[PDB]
Structure formats: C-alpha cells, structure tokens
Symmetry: C3
Subunit: 34 residues, 3 copies
Amino acid sequence: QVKDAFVDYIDNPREYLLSAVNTVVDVHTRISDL
Amino acid sequence: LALRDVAARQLANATKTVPQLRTITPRWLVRLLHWTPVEAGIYRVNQVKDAFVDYIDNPREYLLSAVNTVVDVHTRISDLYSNPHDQIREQLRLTIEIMKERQESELINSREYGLLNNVAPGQLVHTRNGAPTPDDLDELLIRVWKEPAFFLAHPQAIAAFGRECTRRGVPPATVSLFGSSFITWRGVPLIPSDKVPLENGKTKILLLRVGESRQGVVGLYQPNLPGEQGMGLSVRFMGINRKALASYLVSLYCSLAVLTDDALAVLDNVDVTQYHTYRY
Amino acid sequence: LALRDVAARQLANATKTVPQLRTITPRWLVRLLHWTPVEAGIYRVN
C-alpha cells in the first residue's frame, strides 16, 4: 500500500495466509462394491 | 526525501535456498567399495578348508539388514508451500542424506557386519608409542601386502600421522581423488572419515583391499526393489491418516563381507593428542 | 581322500517348492453349480 494516500510504501503490509479445511469421507467397501 | 530501502524491498523477491545440512560428509568409503548384488538377501561365502582341496561345511552366510524411516508431511504444508521448492522432495532428500550417513557409520561400526568387528586375529596391529608413526603404517602394509587399496582413519588421525612425518624429515606424498586431496604412505592413500570412533584420543586406522575378483572387501545390496530410488534404497507411499498426515517409508538394505581374512588389517590404540616441541 | 558330499553340496542350489497346503480340496460343488450375476447385491425371486 501507498503510505498516507513523494510516494512511499508501508513497511508492514498485511499478508493473507490461505487456510485449509478438511473432511474425511468413510465408505465401507461392501457398500460401494455391492 | 524519497522512497526508502525497506519500503522498496517490500516489493522484491528473496532468493531462497534449499535447507543446508552441516552433517553431510563426502562419505568416501561408500564411494570406494565395490558393491555386489544379492538376489534374495542371503550371501554364502564358501572357503577352502585349511588353505586334496576340501571346502568347509559351515560357511558364513550374510543376511542383508533393513533399516526404515517414516517421513510424515502434513498435506497442507505440501499443498500450500511447494513453490518454488517441493516440500516432500526436500524432506525426503534430507532424510536420505541422514540415512546414508548412518549407513556409512554402520559399514564401519556395526556389530553384525562392519570392518572394526570382522578383523581376524593376526591382522590386528598395535602402535609402539601411541602416535601413528610411519612404522605403524608399514606394519599395516605388511599385513595387507598383497594389493592394498586405501587407509581409513579419522581426520585427526591423519593430522597426527602428518605431524609424525614432519618430525621426521619425510613429507608424505599427496594425490587427488574425486577432486579432493589425500595423504598417502607407500602409495596407499589415507581416507578421512569422522565415523571411525574417537574417544579421548585413541582412534583406529584400517587398511583395506576391496574387490570380489581380488578376494577383498565387498559391499552387499538388494538389487530389485519396489520404489527403488537408488542402490539398495526405496521410497514408498504409506498413506494419509485422520489428521491429514501423509507418510513415506524409506528403506535401505546393505551389508558387508570380508572375503579372505588378509584383506583387512587394523592398527589399534592410536593417539592423536601428541605434539612435538621443536628446539634448535 | 577326496572332496566330500556335504562340502560339495555347499555349492549347489536346492529346488524349492511353493508351500503345500493339505486342506485344499477339489471343491466339486462350486464347479458344478451355475452362477448368475447380481448387478447390485439384491436378487428377488418372484
């Protein structure tokens, strides 16, 4: 970002870290086989 | 007043290196040995008895040993942070480096196989004064007079031998191998290895003849493996657990056989802490 | 005196068989029945 918008930039810009969400899906092998 | 350096640096990429491991050694011994494949993990060494020609009825059999390591990587760490360096690739790379260091240490120091334990009586020499003088290395060269290949010693033992040579008038000759320089005595080079034990001084020096055709020392590996990332090495995917940890199995199969008993000699009780005072 | 039989046998391969299981039977009934496939595990006999 431009600071206080010479042209200066802020020295501590925000960084966005992607988050992970998980789900375990369990299926019996006889249910899928039959 | 103009743009700052830190503010401008916020827009710049850093050049990131792969992680550096300080315990990586050149591992000369593994490079110097000859490796023979063992088709199904058993290696029988037959011998002439009391060398008509008779054979011994109970030859020694070498069973290849397996060592394993489980490498766990979170799936979010490999999914998110794999640019420009693959996370799993580096994790397995460092694991395999550590495992090969352990493999060299076991080629020297194992209790089942391993040079320092499989040395025949009469092939063991002792130092006369404690420091590794040229006479001790000449004794070793007497024991393995046939076709010696190299000496194996701790780098501090090599420095002690050099100091003994400098006390005499002898500058030992030097040779270049693998782009590196080594000290030689009577044409047989001294190879460094920090895996040779050292306890309050008191290390050991080895002399080897290598090769299957010369009846020397040979290394043994398992030729065909699932995964098969190298000579006797395999990496296999184990699965993913309920916490999203992906696991990998790294397996290394190895052994070592001394074909005849005069292929290896050990100089024992070597002291590396002695320095000469030069007075003229 | 010459080379022995056991000493010479140390250099010979043995012919190893696959393990033998004595509980294997000819299982005639499975061979004699007719087998019909069931597409999704349910079979209704009207």
